[PDB]
């Protein structure tokens, strides 16, 4: 469970926003995994 959560926390780190930065400069989402159908 800790391993699973550590993964979820790692996905919140700033490093993962690089794409979002670039796509806006010259032109999923944490929480989706918790959206239960």
């Amino acid at each position: 469970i800790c391993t699973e959560q550590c993964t979820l926390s790692d996905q919140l780190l700033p490093k993962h926003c690089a794409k979002t930065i670039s796509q806006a400069v010259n032109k999923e989402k944490p929480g989706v995994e918790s959206m239960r159908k």
Partner: protein
């Protein structure tokens, strides 16, 4: 002077705390987040008695008045 002095140190703060890995990743994607150009305000900030037209001006005191007002506006904005 006060205006650019506050902006200079606000940018410095935001730059000092910006994640390093994110910087490198933005660089590798041709979207480099540019570093703040260094400046030289320290000597101006140290001026306690500027001789002008007979008056003795405390430049430090005047700047502090503006910079202090800038700090409060920043905090007021964030909230």
């Amino acid at each position: 002077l006060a205006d650019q002095i506050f902006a200079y140190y606000k940018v410095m703060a935001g730059s000092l705390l910006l994640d390093k890995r994110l910087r490198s990743e933005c660089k590798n994607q041709g979207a480099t987040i540019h570093l703040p150009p260094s400046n030289r305000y320290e000597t101006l900030l140290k001026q306690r008695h500027v001789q002008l037209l007979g008056r003795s001006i405390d430049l430090n005191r005047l700047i502090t008045q503006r910079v202090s007002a800038a700090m409060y506006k920043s905090l007021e904005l964030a909230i």
